[PDB]
mmCIF file with all atom_site columns, C-alpha atoms in Angstrom:
data_model
loop_
_atom_site.group_PDB
_atom_site.id
_atom_site.type_symbol
_atom_site.label_atom_id
_atom_site.label_alt_id
_atom_site.label_comp_id
_atom_site.label_asym_id
_atom_site.label_entity_id
_atom_site.label_seq_id
_atom_site.pdbx_PDB_ins_code
_atom_site.Cartn_x
_atom_site.Cartn_y
_atom_site.Cartn_z
_atom_site.occupancy
_atom_site.B_iso_or_equiv
_atom_site.pdbx_formal_charge
_atom_site.auth_seq_id
_atom_site.auth_comp_id
_atom_site.auth_asym_id
_atom_site.auth_atom_id
_atom_site.pdbx_PDB_model_num
ATOM 1   C CA . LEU A 1 1  ? -13.199 14.476 -22.429 1.00 49.76 ? 1  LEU A CA 1
ATOM 2   C CA . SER A 1 2  ? -13.404 11.442 -19.901 1.00 49.61 ? 2  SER A CA 1
ATOM 3   C CA . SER A 1 3  ? -12.585 9.039  -22.913 1.00 45.09 ? 3  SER A CA 1
ATOM 4   C CA . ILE A 1 4  ? -9.050  10.186 -23.154 1.00 45.62 ? 4  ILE A CA 1
ATOM 5   C CA . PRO A 1 5  ? -6.890  8.118  -20.742 1.00 42.45 ? 5  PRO A CA 1
ATOM 6   C CA . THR A 1 6  ? -5.242  10.363 -18.288 1.00 40.46 ? 6  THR A CA 1
ATOM 7   C CA . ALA A 1 7  ? -1.387  10.167 -17.819 1.00 41.23 ? 7  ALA A CA 1
ATOM 8   C CA . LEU A 1 8  ? -1.493  7.736  -14.771 1.00 38.94 ? 8  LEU A CA 1
ATOM 9   C CA . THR A 1 9  ? -3.318  5.387  -16.850 1.00 42.71 ? 9  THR A CA 1
ATOM 10  C CA . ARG A 1 10 ? -1.169  5.374  -19.761 1.00 42.52 ? 10 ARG A CA 1
ATOM 11  C CA . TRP A 1 11 ? 1.578   4.912  -17.633 1.00 42.88 ? 11 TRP A CA 1
ATOM 12  C CA . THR A 1 12 ? 0.191   2.117  -16.009 1.00 40.74 ? 12 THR A CA 1
ATOM 13  C CA . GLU A 1 13 ? -0.035  0.556  -19.229 1.00 39.72 ? 13 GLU A CA 1
ATOM 14  C CA . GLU A 1 14 ? 3.442   1.523  -19.836 1.00 38.68 ? 14 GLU A CA 1
ATOM 15  C CA . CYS A 1 15 ? 4.593   0.141  -16.333 1.00 35.78 ? 15 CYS A CA 1
ATOM 16  C CA . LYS A 1 16 ? 2.258   -3.424 -17.027 1.00 32.67 ? 16 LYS A CA 1
ATOM 17  C CA . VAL A 1 17 ? 3.915   -3.907 -20.231 1.00 33.19 ? 17 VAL A CA 1
ATOM 18  C CA . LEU A 1 18 ? 7.415   -2.976 -18.733 1.00 31.32 ? 18 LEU A CA 1
ATOM 19  C CA . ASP A 1 19 ? 7.567   -4.298 -15.289 1.00 33.01 ? 19 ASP A CA 1
ATOM 20  C CA . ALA A 1 20 ? 4.730   -6.131 -13.804 1.00 33.28 ? 20 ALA A CA 1
ATOM 21  C CA . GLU A 1 21 ? 6.272   -7.157 -10.629 1.00 31.96 ? 21 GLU A CA 1
ATOM 22  C CA . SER A 1 22 ? 9.189   -4.687 -10.314 1.00 31.88 ? 22 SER A CA 1
ATOM 23  C CA . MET A 1 23 ? 6.944   -1.490 -9.880  1.00 32.51 ? 23 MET A CA 1
ATOM 24  C CA . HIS A 1 24 ? 5.998   -2.541 -6.601  1.00 34.10 ? 24 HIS A CA 1
ATOM 25  C CA . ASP A 1 25 ? 9.928   -2.917 -5.765  1.00 30.35 ? 25 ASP A CA 1
ATOM 26  C CA . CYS A 1 26 ? 10.440  0.337  -6.971  1.00 30.86 ? 26 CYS A CA 1
ATOM 27  C CA . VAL A 1 27 ? 7.279   1.509  -4.643  1.00 30.87 ? 27 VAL A CA 1
ATOM 28  C CA . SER A 1 28 ? 9.380   0.536  -1.744  1.00 32.06 ? 28 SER A CA 1
ATOM 29  C CA . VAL A 1 29 ? 12.488  1.829  -2.516  1.00 29.72 ? 29 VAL A CA 1
ATOM 30  C CA . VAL A 1 30 ? 10.976  5.174  -3.275  1.00 30.73 ? 30 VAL A CA 1
ATOM 31  C CA . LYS A 1 31 ? 8.683   5.201  -0.211  1.00 29.09 ? 31 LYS A CA 1
ATOM 32  C CA . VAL A 1 32 ? 11.779  4.746  2.117   1.00 28.87 ? 32 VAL A CA 1
ATOM 33  C CA . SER A 1 33 ? 12.973  7.808  0.720   1.00 27.97 ? 33 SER A CA 1
ATOM 34  C CA . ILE A 1 34 ? 9.465   9.601  0.858   1.00 24.98 ? 34 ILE A CA 1
ATOM 35  C CA . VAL A 1 35 ? 8.303   8.409  4.204   1.00 26.48 ? 35 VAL A CA 1
ATOM 36  C CA . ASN A 1 36 ? 11.351  9.296  6.487   1.00 28.91 ? 36 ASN A CA 1
ATOM 37  C CA . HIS A 1 37 ? 11.130  13.161 4.724   1.00 30.63 ? 37 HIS A CA 1
ATOM 38  C CA . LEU A 1 38 ? 7.258   13.659 5.443   1.00 33.33 ? 38 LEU A CA 1
ATOM 39  C CA . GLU A 1 39 ? 7.741   12.176 8.979   1.00 34.54 ? 39 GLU A CA 1
ATOM 40  C CA . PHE A 1 40 ? 10.745  14.311 9.613   1.00 32.09 ? 40 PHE A CA 1
ATOM 41  C CA . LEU A 1 41 ? 8.528   17.557 8.457   1.00 32.01 ? 41 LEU A CA 1
ATOM 42  C CA . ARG A 1 42 ? 5.580   15.899 10.450  1.00 31.43 ? 42 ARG A CA 1
ATOM 43  C CA . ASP A 1 43 ? 7.423   15.999 13.336  1.00 31.68 ? 43 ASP A CA 1
ATOM 44  C CA . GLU A 1 44 ? 8.762   19.161 12.974  1.00 31.83 ? 44 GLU A CA 1
ATOM 45  C CA . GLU A 1 45 ? 5.478   20.714 12.229  1.00 34.89 ? 45 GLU A CA 1
ATOM 46  C CA . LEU A 1 46 ? 4.059   19.203 15.216  1.00 37.04 ? 46 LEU A CA 1
ATOM 47  C CA . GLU A 1 47 ? 6.935   20.588 17.775  1.00 37.10 ? 47 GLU A CA 1
ATOM 48  C CA . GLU A 1 48 ? 5.972   24.188 15.774  1.00 37.62 ? 48 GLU A CA 1
ATOM 49  C CA . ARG A 1 49 ? 2.380   23.677 17.153  1.00 36.80 ? 49 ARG A CA 1
ATOM 50  C CA . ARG A 1 50 ? 3.251   22.717 20.594  1.00 36.76 ? 50 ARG A CA 1
ATOM 51  C CA . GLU A 1 51 ? 5.616   25.752 20.856  1.00 33.87 ? 51 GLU A CA 1
ATOM 52  C CA . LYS A 1 52 ? 3.240   27.802 19.151  1.00 31.33 ? 52 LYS A CA 1
ATOM 53  C CA . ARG A 1 53 ? 0.277   26.596 21.440  1.00 29.36 ? 53 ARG A CA 1
ATOM 54  C CA . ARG A 1 54 ? 2.832   27.168 24.671  1.00 25.81 ? 54 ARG A CA 1
ATOM 55  C CA . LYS A 1 55 ? 4.202   30.693 23.449  1.00 28.22 ? 55 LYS A CA 1
ATOM 56  C CA . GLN A 1 56 ? 0.217   31.615 23.304  1.00 29.51 ? 56 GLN A CA 1
ATOM 57  C CA . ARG B 2 1  ? 2.642   15.804 3.642   1.00 28.94 ? 1  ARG B CA 1
ATOM 58  C CA . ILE B 2 2  ? 1.356   13.563 6.004   1.00 27.84 ? 2  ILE B CA 1
ATOM 59  C CA . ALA B 2 3  ? -1.272  14.396 8.030   1.00 29.49 ? 3  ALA B CA 1
ATOM 60  C CA . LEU B 2 4  ? -1.649  15.696 11.849  1.00 29.06 ? 4  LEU B CA 1
ATOM 61  C CA . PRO B 2 5  ? -4.587  15.152 13.377  1.00 29.88 ? 5  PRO B CA 1
ATOM 62  C CA . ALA B 2 6  ? -5.910  17.430 15.697  1.00 25.81 ? 6  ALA B CA 1
ATOM 63  C CA . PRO B 2 7  ? -4.623  18.066 19.728  1.00 24.07 ? 7  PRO B CA 1
ATOM 64  C CA . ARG B 2 8  ? -6.464  15.164 21.263  1.00 23.59 ? 8  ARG B CA 1
ATOM 65  C CA . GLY B 2 9  ? -6.368  17.292 24.549  1.00 26.15 ? 9  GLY B CA 1
ATOM 66  C CA . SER B 2 10 ? -4.770  20.552 25.845  1.00 27.68 ? 10 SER B CA 1
ATOM 67  C CA . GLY B 2 11 ? -2.260  20.035 28.196  1.00 27.22 ? 11 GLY B CA 1
ATOM 68  C CA . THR B 2 12 ? 1.283   19.198 27.476  1.00 26.06 ? 12 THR B CA 1
ATOM 69  C CA . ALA B 2 13 ? 1.926   16.893 30.319  1.00 27.33 ? 13 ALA B CA 1
ATOM 70  C CA . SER B 2 14 ? -0.519  14.074 29.822  1.00 28.86 ? 14 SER B CA 1
ATOM 71  C CA . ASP B 2 15 ? -2.205  15.123 26.654  1.00 30.33 ? 15 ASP B CA 1
ATOM 72  C CA . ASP B 2 16 ? 0.718   15.906 24.407  1.00 29.25 ? 16 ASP B CA 1
ATOM 73  C CA . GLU B 2 17 ? 2.520   12.485 25.859  1.00 26.99 ? 17 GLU B CA 1
ATOM 74  C CA . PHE B 2 18 ? -0.129  10.450 24.597  1.00 29.93 ? 18 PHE B CA 1
ATOM 75  C CA . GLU B 2 19 ? -0.734  12.522 21.367  1.00 28.57 ? 19 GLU B CA 1
ATOM 76  C CA . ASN B 2 20 ? 3.214   11.455 20.303  1.00 26.13 ? 20 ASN B CA 1
ATOM 77  C CA . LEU B 2 21 ? 2.002   7.912  21.475  1.00 28.24 ? 21 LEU B CA 1
ATOM 78  C CA . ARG B 2 22 ? -0.809  8.493  18.992  1.00 30.63 ? 22 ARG B CA 1
ATOM 79  C CA . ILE B 2 23 ? 0.930   10.421 15.922  1.00 31.41 ? 23 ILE B CA 1
ATOM 80  C CA . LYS B 2 24 ? 4.187   8.927  16.012  1.00 30.96 ? 24 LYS B CA 1
ATOM 81  C CA . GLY B 2 25 ? 3.168   5.278  17.184  1.00 31.88 ? 25 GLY B CA 1
ATOM 82  C CA . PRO B 2 26 ? 4.711   2.474  15.282  1.00 32.10 ? 26 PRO B CA 1
ATOM 83  C CA . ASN B 2 27 ? 0.731   1.505  14.315  1.00 33.91 ? 27 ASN B CA 1
ATOM 84  C CA . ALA B 2 28 ? -0.838  4.882  13.389  1.00 31.54 ? 28 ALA B CA 1
ATOM 85  C CA . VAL B 2 29 ? -2.362  6.131  9.938   1.00 27.51 ? 29 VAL B CA 1
ATOM 86  C CA . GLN B 2 30 ? -0.470  8.460  8.396   1.00 27.73 ? 30 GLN B CA 1
ATOM 87  C CA . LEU B 2 31 ? -3.507  9.962  5.819   1.00 29.39 ? 31 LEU B CA 1
ATOM 88  C CA . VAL B 2 32 ? -1.783  12.390 3.222   1.00 30.95 ? 32 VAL B CA 1
ATOM 89  C CA . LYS B 2 33 ? -2.390  16.163 2.668   1.00 29.26 ? 33 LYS B CA 1
ATOM 90  C CA . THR B 2 34 ? -1.426  18.408 -0.250  1.00 25.43 ? 34 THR B CA 1
ATOM 91  C CA . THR B 2 35 ? 1.214   21.350 0.167   1.00 24.63 ? 35 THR B CA 1
ATOM 92  C CA . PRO B 2 36 ? -0.626  24.983 -1.011  1.00 23.06 ? 36 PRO B CA 1
ATOM 93  C CA . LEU B 2 37 ? -0.058  25.102 -4.803  1.00 23.19 ? 37 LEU B CA 1
ATOM 94  C CA . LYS B 2 38 ? 3.245   26.952 -5.971  1.00 23.05 ? 38 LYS B CA 1
ATOM 95  C CA . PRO B 2 39 ? 3.430   28.677 -9.117  1.00 23.17 ? 39 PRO B CA 1
ATOM 96  C CA . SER B 2 40 ? 4.860   26.252 -11.480 1.00 21.67 ? 40 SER B CA 1
ATOM 97  C CA . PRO B 2 41 ? 6.086   28.180 -14.885 1.00 22.59 ? 41 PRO B CA 1
ATOM 98  C CA . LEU B 2 42 ? 5.371   26.830 -18.341 1.00 23.51 ? 42 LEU B CA 1
ATOM 99  C CA . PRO B 2 43 ? 8.090   24.844 -19.191 1.00 26.44 ? 43 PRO B CA 1
ATOM 100 C CA . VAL B 2 44 ? 9.733   25.680 -22.825 1.00 23.56 ? 44 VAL B CA 1
ATOM 101 C CA . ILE B 2 45 ? 8.918   23.142 -25.157 1.00 22.21 ? 45 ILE B CA 1
ATOM 102 C CA . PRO B 2 46 ? 12.471  21.827 -27.063 1.00 19.18 ? 46 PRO B CA 1
ATOM 103 C CA . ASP B 2 47 ? 12.895  22.388 -30.868 1.00 22.02 ? 47 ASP B CA 1
ATOM 104 C CA . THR B 2 48 ? 13.103  18.947 -31.341 1.00 24.23 ? 48 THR B CA 1
ATOM 105 C CA . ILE B 2 49 ? 9.732   18.127 -29.579 1.00 22.69 ? 49 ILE B CA 1
ATOM 106 C CA . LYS B 2 50 ? 8.278   20.955 -31.892 1.00 22.21 ? 50 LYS B CA 1
ATOM 107 C CA . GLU B 2 51 ? 9.447   19.388 -35.068 1.00 25.27 ? 51 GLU B CA 1
ATOM 108 C CA . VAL B 2 52 ? 7.786   15.988 -33.295 1.00 24.74 ? 52 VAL B CA 1
ATOM 109 C CA . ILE B 2 53 ? 4.524   17.662 -32.963 1.00 25.31 ? 53 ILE B CA 1
ATOM 110 C CA . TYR B 2 54 ? 4.297   19.571 -36.175 1.00 26.02 ? 54 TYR B CA 1
ATOM 111 C CA . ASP B 2 55 ? 4.858   16.837 -37.992 1.00 23.37 ? 55 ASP B CA 1
ATOM 112 C CA . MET B 2 56 ? 1.550   15.280 -37.113 1.00 24.32 ? 56 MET B CA 1
ATOM 113 C CA . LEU B 2 57 ? -0.015  18.732 -37.030 1.00 25.19 ? 57 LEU B CA 1
ATOM 114 C CA . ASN B 2 58 ? 1.235   18.774 -41.059 1.00 26.24 ? 58 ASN B CA 1
ATOM 115 C CA . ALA B 2 59 ? -0.029  14.865 -41.168 1.00 26.74 ? 59 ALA B CA 1
ATOM 116 C CA . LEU B 2 60 ? -3.570  16.360 -40.579 1.00 28.27 ? 60 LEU B CA 1
ATOM 117 C CA . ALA B 2 61 ? -3.405  17.804 -44.041 1.00 30.66 ? 61 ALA B CA 1
#
């Protein structure tokens, strides 16, 4: 049932209790590593798409 | 995966040049798409986690 709290809501409670303001800092530190990887793969897929268009 | 917006205009000299300006531009809208589901196998539950779960089930009775 939807009354049962989801894992993200339980983790949200945990985070609040254990780190209200340091969550943002961890989001920033982890973001720096995620966005660089996803943008690298975005640029590789974009190159692949342009190449496949040219090869067509 | 950060999303790729559609090819704005066919043509590499002009359209793809300004498609790199748009998609890779400092100011952009990196929407997200998920990858296709990879077939995750079930994790084997450790025995201590089963002596934790079983003790509650015994507390039912």
